[PDB]
């Protein structure tokens, strides 16, 4: 199996730099060319640039030409990406990519082939001036099929990772995207419906976790007796 | 042995009273009573503002009180103003022919009101273009905090080969400074519509841009 | 720097329907170019390589076409699954591109919604603030008016809506609408109903609460 | 009216020996020397009483300073034999106590300006002043100093009768090893055609005396 | 034109069998083979003259000295049997003459680089790489001070080059230092103009071929 | 051992110096196979002298060998600073056998005492969350090679963690040297200010060095 799993994300002042990394598992690193793809929110994948993961040559877009840096430590088998100078188009997600190994044609020529078989989860970057905060985790209980849920409310920057019993449950799940409220800070929501005959028999935990703010809430819901 | 330990940043908030320690041994600090202070300026000579243990000389403001406890001298500012941002340096009797002087504490005022950059960028001149050289100049003065990146554009593209930036220096008026030379060629001042100047400071951003003159 | 336009950037099909996306290359590349599907949340999924080879666990469904300077991507019949934005990439020359993006969305039967009401909690109520859920599960088409009535008076200015991407099952969808209100304007008054007016709804369905039950 | 004047922009080869002197004005006990380099702190050097005919060294200056004074000139001479790269830094005379009072407080009360020594291999290659024109109810004039070592250069307006608005910006160490300078100064636009503005570089290591007018291009 | 290459850098459990090559250029009559323990003074091994084909051994290495060559390459090998921890050593290639003259002079005129052959049971461990930042401290010189600082490797030695070795002005690499741990630590640092601190990126390289390593490192100063 | 080398000639510019060899009939006495290598250190050997008294094309001549009885000398006439190096002398001890010396560290006692250059490094932020730290004390540029180094804590000294090079000469002639202080994450960020003191020939130069938040 492969495997590339990306840093967590992280909110920078505008003009600072970010650092993302990228450590690839279950393959040989040091026989493949990885490249970095950047996505702002609601916008197109956009290229930024390769690196060699032998030798470190670095090949980088003329947009981020003096901006991005790529780095390689070969004994961890992680790749760093450095942007610097940031803007507000900078709040984007980093992904970075694995393409497979370039080949020699019958001639001889060297043909490149560069397209993207594994990808990592991504990592976002905020550019803010804006603090960050911890999340407030609340339960909304309910009164055939019921639903509950769980609210994330008064959080900065982006993003929550929600799961439900430890990531035992999956049928029927809503994680809403999150909503920017009026102070600055973020809030979500996240429900699941399930059969009311459980809701007696199974405890339904929501695990609630904010990685910028090193905040992990278990919250059990139960039902508000009346 | 026998050195001075000034923690290198203290900082205070205007009215409060801030405490610089400089820590040394029983030879030096310890033993005898001969411990002084100078307050540097960036820029300027040191002055005098301590000349004993605990001793103001004639013109030195009495906010300013020096004291000495076991092996450690502390020099007392009262009545913090934006005029005593600079560097203190402790300096005390390490035995006959010795003076040993402290790392230097750089005391920050926090009273801080932060201040747009004045950009003013100056194209080349007709001597120098006419010895086939050109220097693109951008001052920038009065900003504050002393933290700004510079960048070149060309007509709108980035140029990062031949920028020269000085890093920022505090000013007199306690505001920072800083200046950026871009040399180029004749050639490529005079084939681009107009070279722009931008700096970016806490968020913000100005611009100043600049075209050639013929006739 | 080559530029890639995608025709369309939106679309909405009915199951089984066959679908056709097209990337056109401002210059020549014979074969160099890629298709990616990228469903919302997750990373991009390489689908097509060399423009026309099938990427190694791909259903049978999709294909690809096209050289010069003009592509194709076809899916024989649309999946529920199917649902994410398609972008299409070059590698004939550096620097490589990506497409504008086609989001694809399924035409589905009208579905009415599965209306909740959740009172706030009584541990935020310890932190001044309150706030009042109203959950619309499973629904279509994506329109639905939603209204909070605090002592059947009408509250505006105060509720925040979010709705989630279309369900790669059933293909519906979900809205969260959030009434956030002072403990003490929330201790003002005492019936709490969210209205909700949908297409598959007859009649406006209310979900109501007295305070403190 | 009890200041003390120090001579010298001195640049010296590594392995040379310099010599720094101190005029003092007023009544002087002693005078001490300070050195510091750029950017880092201060450290003591020695100590002369020319009326007691006493000197003193660091431990680490130890057969390289040589403190000697002359009472007919009333000066005070350090010399600092075997330079290194080390050694570049701004040296400072200080006074220790007045005419009277024969006693030391180890309190250097008034500091002469900087004198600045810088120790390198390579050659001094002299300034290129050109003019910064201004274009358009306050205008900026200016000089460039470009490509030269080492520091420092002096920059005045109208031989020292302009300092009102006057901001010379600290040099800039390219890559190329040289250094580079503006001299900016705030003057009314009502002035641009009335009064001539001169600004005087001097860079005395290779002395290189250079005026130049600043004004607005022509057609 | 006439100096001698050495290749490797090498690394072997004791018991094990050790190849050094020596690479001529130019004319060379004869090589012979010395070595360095660390600390130590120099001891001769053999010599070898590819042109008669006589090779010398000393007394003590009777039975685990090999001196080979092949002249298609131009190239002359050693090897080390039964690899004990006395062998530590650097191996250095000596000329014994011009391409003429066949006489020997017993004076080795040019040598090679150190080849170092770490003769070790402990298993290899692979450095970490950290990036020692600039300061007001450091820049405010005109000159400022980079640094990385390669932590916790096994064993000697490690490569350290600046941008890919187009750096080298004011790069002073520090030895290592021997922890209480057995592990080695060393720092690289470099001078540059305060000026280019914004414009130029400034990357340290390290290898550490023992390990297969190679560990980019870029050094910014911290905001 | 096989040879006997004076371990430690020293000299003075302009003076010359003496380095003996001493052998038996059978390696030094019997035949005129001798030679004198100079080797600074991290560098590999160079040729001196060959065949006792033979100079090879660009050895100065202040260098000049020599041989009496069992004992071989090599003279150096024109002192310099760069002569600061280790000087073996290597024999014909028979067929298939040559012996070297055990080296002489030839000291130029003239020089001027060199200050050391002191750089403190702080961790990096890298190695912090890596739940480690380390303070860097780089000292280069001092002669004698001989430095004593101290950590302080605020104003108390640290023992425990501190890792010291022994010095080594530069290219320069000069001596350089490192210490590294391996720390907690917690010990740093809990103490104002850390110091690096490096004592040299009775003078002291302190560095010192405080966190960043």
């Known amino acids: 199996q492969v495997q590339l799993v990306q840093s967590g994300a992280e909110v920078k002042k505008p003009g600072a730099s970010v650092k993302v990394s990228c450590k690839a598992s279950?393959?040989?690193?040091?026989?493949?060319?990885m490249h970095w793809v950047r996505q702002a929110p609601g916008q197109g994948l956009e290229w930024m640039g390769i690196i060699n993961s032998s030798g470190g040559s670095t090949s980088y877009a003329q947009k981020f030409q003096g901006r991005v840096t790529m780095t390689r430590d070969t004994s961890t088998s992680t790749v760093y990406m450095e942007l610097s100078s940031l803007r507000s188009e900078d709040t984007a997600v980093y992904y970075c990519?694995?393409?497979?190994?370039?080949?020699?044609?019958?001639?001889?020529?060297?043909?490149?082939?560069?397209?993207?078989?594994?990808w990592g989860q991504g990592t976002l970057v905020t550019v803010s001036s804006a603090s960050t905060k911890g999340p407030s985790v609340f339960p909304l209980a309910p009164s055939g099929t019921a639903a509950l849920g769980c609210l994330v409310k008064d959080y900065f920057p982006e993003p929550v990772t929600v799961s439900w019993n430890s990531g035992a449950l999956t049928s029927g799940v809503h994680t809403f995207p999150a909503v920017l409220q009026s102070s600055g800070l973020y809030s979500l929501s996240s429900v699941v419906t399930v059969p009311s005959s459980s809701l007696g028999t199974q405890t339904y935990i929501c695990n609630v976790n904010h990685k910028p703010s090193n905040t992990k809430v278990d919250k059990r819901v139960e039902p508000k007796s009346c | 042995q026998s050195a001075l330990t000034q923690p290198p940043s203290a900082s205070g908030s205007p009215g409060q009273s801030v405490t610089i320690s400089c820590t040394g041994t029983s030879s030096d600090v310890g033993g005898y009573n001969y411990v002084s202070w100078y307050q540097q300026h960036p820029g300027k000579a040191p002055k005098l503002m301590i000349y004993e243990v605990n001793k103001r000389p004639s013109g030195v403001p009495d906010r300013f009180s020096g004291s000495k406890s076991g092996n450690t001298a502390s020099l007392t500012v009262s009545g913090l103003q934006a005029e005593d941002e600079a560097d203190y340096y402790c300096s005390s009797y390490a035995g006959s022919n010795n003076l040993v002087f402290g790392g230097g504490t750089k005391l920050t005022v926090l009273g801080q009101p932060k201040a747009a950059p004045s950009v003013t960028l100056f194209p080349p001149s007709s001597e120098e273009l006419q010895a086939n050289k050109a220097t693109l100049v951008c001052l920038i003065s009065d900003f504050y905090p002393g933290a700004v990146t510079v960048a070149w554009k060309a007509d709108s593209s980035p140029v990062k080969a031949g920028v020269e930036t000085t890093t920022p220096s505090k000013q007199s008026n306690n505001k920072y400074a800083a200046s950026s030379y871009l040399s180029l060629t004749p050639e490529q001042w005079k084939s681009h519509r107009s070279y722009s100047c931008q700096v970016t400071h806490e968020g913000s951003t100005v611009e100043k841009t600049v075209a050639p003159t013929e006739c | 720097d080559i530029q890639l336009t995608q025709s369309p950037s939106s679309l909405s099909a009915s199951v089984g329907d066959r679908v056709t996306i097209t990337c056109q290359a401002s210059?020549?590349?014979?074969?160099?170019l890629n298709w990616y599907q990228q469903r919302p949340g997750k990373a991009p999924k390489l689908l097509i390589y060399?423009?026309?080879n099938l990427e190694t666990g791909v259903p049978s469904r999709f294909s690809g076409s096209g050289s010069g300077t003009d592509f194709t991507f076809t899916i024989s019949s649309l999946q529920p699954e199917d649902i994410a934005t398609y972008y299409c990439?070059?590698?004939?020359?550096?620097?490589?591109?990506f497409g504008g993006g086609t989001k694809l969305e399924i035409k589905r039967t009208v579905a009415a919604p599965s209306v909740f009401i959740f009172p706030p909690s009584d541990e935020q109520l310890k932190s001044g603030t309150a706030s009042v859920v109203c959950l619309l599960n499973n629904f279509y088409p994506r329109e639905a008016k939603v209204q909070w009535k605090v002592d059947n008076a009408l509250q505006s200015g105060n509720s925040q809506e979010s709705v989630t991407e279309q369900d790669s099952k059933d293909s519906t969808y979900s809205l969260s609408s959030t009434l956030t209100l002072s403990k003490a304007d929330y201790e003002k008054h005492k019936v709490y109903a969210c209205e909700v007016t949908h297409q598959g709804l007859s009649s406006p369905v209310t979900k109501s609460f007295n305070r403190g039950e | 009216?009890?200041?003390?004047?120090?001579?010298?922009?001195?640049?010296?080869?590594?392995?040379?020996?310099?010599?720094?002197?101190?005029?003092?004005?007023?009544?002087?006990?002693?005078?001490?020397?300070?050195?510091?380099?750029?950017?880092?702190?201060?450290?003591?050097?020695?100590?002369?009483?020319?009326?007691?005919?006493?000197?003193?060294?660091?431990?680490?200056?130890?057969?390289?300073?040589?403190?000697?004074?002359?009472?007919?000139?009333?000066?005070?001479?350090?010399?600092?034999?075997?330079?290194?790269?080390?050694?570049?830094?701004?040296?400072?005379?200080?006074?220790?106590?007045?005419?009277?009072?024969?006693?030391?407080?180890?309190?250097?009360?008034?500091?002469?300006?900087?004198?600045?020594?810088?120790?390198?291999?390579?050659?001094?290659?002299?300034?290129?002043?050109?003019?910064?024109?201004?274009?358009?109810?306050?205008?900026?004039?200016?000089?460039?100093?470009?490509?030269?070592?080492?520091?420092?250069?002096?920059?005045?307006?109208?031989?020292?009768?302009?300092?009102?608005?006057?901001?010379?910006?600290?040099?800039?160490?390219?890559?190329?090893?040289?250094?580079?300078?503006?001299?900016?100064?705030?003057?009314?636009?009502?002035?641009?055609?009335?009064?001539?503005?001169?600004?005087?570089?001097?860079?005395?290591?290779?002395?290189?005396?250079?005026?130049?007018?600043?004004?607005?291009?022509?057609? | 034109?006439?100096?001698?290459?050495?290749?490797?850098?090498?690394?072997?459990?004791?018991?094990?069998?050790?190849?050094?090559?020596?690479?001529?250029?130019?004319?060379?009559?004869?090589?012979?083979?010395?070595?360095?323990?660390?600390?130590?003074?120099?001891?001769?091994?053999?010599?070898?003259?590819?042109?008669?084909?006589?090779?010398?051994?000393?007394?003590?290495?009777?039975?685990?000295?090999?001196?080979?060559?092949?002249?298609?390459?131009?190239?002359?090998?050693?090897?080390?049997?039964?690899?004990?921890?006395?062998?530590?050593?650097?191996?250095?290639?000596?000329?014994?003459?011009?391409?003429?003259?066949?006489?020997?002079?017993?004076?080795?005129?040019?040598?090679?680089?150190?080849?170092?052959?770490?003769?070790?049971?402990?298993?290899?461990?692979?450095?970490?790489?950290?990036?020692?930042?600039?300061?007001?401290?450091?820049?405010?010189?005109?000159?400022?001070?980079?640094?990385?600082?390669?932590?916790?490797?096994?064993?000697?030695?490690?490569?350290?080059?600046?941008?890919?070795?187009?750096?080298?002005?004011?790069?002073?690499?520090?030895?290592?230092?021997?922890?209480?741990?057995?592990?080695?630590?060393?720092?690289?640092?470099?001078?540059?103009?305060?000026?280019?601190?914004?414009?130029?990126?400034?990357?340290?390289?390290?290898?550490?071929?023992?390990?297969?390593?190679?560990?980019?490192?870029?050094?910014?100063?911290?905001? | 051992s096989a040879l006997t080398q004076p371990p430690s000639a020293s000299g003075s510019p302009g003076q010359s110096v003496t380095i003996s060899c001493t052998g038996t009939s059978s390696d030094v006495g019997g035949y005129n196979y001798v030679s004198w290598y100079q080797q600074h250190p991290g560098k590999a050997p160079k040729l001196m002298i060959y065949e006792v008294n033979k100079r090879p094309s660009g050895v100065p001549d202040r260098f000049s060998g020599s041989k009496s009885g069992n004992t071989a000398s090599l003279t150096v006439s024109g002192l310099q600073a760069e002569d600061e190096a280790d000087y073996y002398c290597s024999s014909y001890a028979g067929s298939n056998n040559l012996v070297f010396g055990g080296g002489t560290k030839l000291t130029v006692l003239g020089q001027p005492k060199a200050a050391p250059s002191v750089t403190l490094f702080p961790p990096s932020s890298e190695e912090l969350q890596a739940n480690k730290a380390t303070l860097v004390c780089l000292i280069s540029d001092f002669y004698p090679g001989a430095v004593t180094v101290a950590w302080k804590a605020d104003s108390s000294p640290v023992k425990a963690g501190v890792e010291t090079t022994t010095p080594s000469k530069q290219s320069n002639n000069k001596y350089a040297a490192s210490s590294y202080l391996s720390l907690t994450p917690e010990q740093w960020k809990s103490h104002r200010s850390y110091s690096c003191q490096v004592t040299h020939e009775g003078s002291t130069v302190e560095k010192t060095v405080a966190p960043t938040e």
């Open positions: 990519a694995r393409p497979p190994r370039n080949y020699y044609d019958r001639s001889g020529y060297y043909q490149r082939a560069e397209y993207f078989q594994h």
């Open positions: 210059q020549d590349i014979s074969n160099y």
């Open positions: 060399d423009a026309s």
């Open positions: 990439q070059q590698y004939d020359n550096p620097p490589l591109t």
């Open positions: 279950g393959y040989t690193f040091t026989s493949y060319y």
